[PDB]
Amino acid sequence: PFTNHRGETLLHIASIKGDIPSVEYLLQNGSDPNVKDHAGWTPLHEACNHGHLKVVELLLQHKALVNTTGYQNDSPLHDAAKNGHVDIVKLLLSYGASRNAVNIFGLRPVDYTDDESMKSLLLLP
């Protein structure tokens, strides 16, 4: 419940930073990873956007909802796809991330990449 003026918890902040010891300890001690700041971001959205694979994985192990819509209704998959984080796209998908989820613009994660390696995970062969 303790947040800064932007509604960010310590978990959000550690997830932005990719601070594994912090994320790990908070989650180990019962911090609910299903929590939004004022804008709509979950700690998972933040880790995916900033490329923090291990943090993403910890959040998922601790029951962070893989498909939650955040700011502009972006999924965690949007954030990872957007920012060219192929490893995180694979992980998210392995947890059941919705490949063709749409944000408020009606756009999919694939709509945010020209990368071949990224497109191959998000499209069918």
Query: In this structure, what CATH number is given to the domain that contains residue 38?
Result: 1.25.40.20
Residue written as token pair 């601070």: 19
> Which technique was the structure solved with, according to the deposited record?
X-ray
In the chain, how many domains are there? 1
Q: Cα separation of 9 and 84, whole Å?
A: 26
Q: Are 47 and 63 in contact (CB under 8 A)?
A: no
CA distances from 41 to 48, 119, 125 (A): 11, 25, 32
Query: For 40-58, b where at least 16 C-beta lie within 10 A, e where not — what string?
Result: ebbbbbbbbbbbbbebbbb
The parent domain of residue 123 ranges over: 1-125
Given a contact cutoff of 8 angstroms between Cβ atoms, the answer to whether 60 and 91 are in contact is: yes
Say how many CA atoms lie within 13 Å of 75 toward its Cβ: 25
What backbone torsions phi and psi does residue 55 show, to the nearest 5 degrees?
-65, -45
3-state percent helix, strand, coil for the chain, nearest multiple of 5: 50, 0, 50
CA geometry: angle 80, 85, 87, nearest 5 deg: 110
What whole-number distance in Å separates Cα of residue 32 and Cα of residue 117?
A: 33
Residue 115 and residue 105 in contact, taking contact as beta carbons nearer than 8 Å: no
- At what resolution in Å was this solved? 2.0
Alpha-carbon span 45 to 12, nearest angstrom: 9
Instruction: Name which of 17, 19, 84, 9 is nearest 41 in CA terms.
Output: 9
User: Dihedral of CA 19/28/11/2: which sign?
Assistant: negative
Phi, psi of 119 (to 5 degrees): -60, -30
Distance CA 14, CA 99 (A): 27
The full length of the chain comes to 125
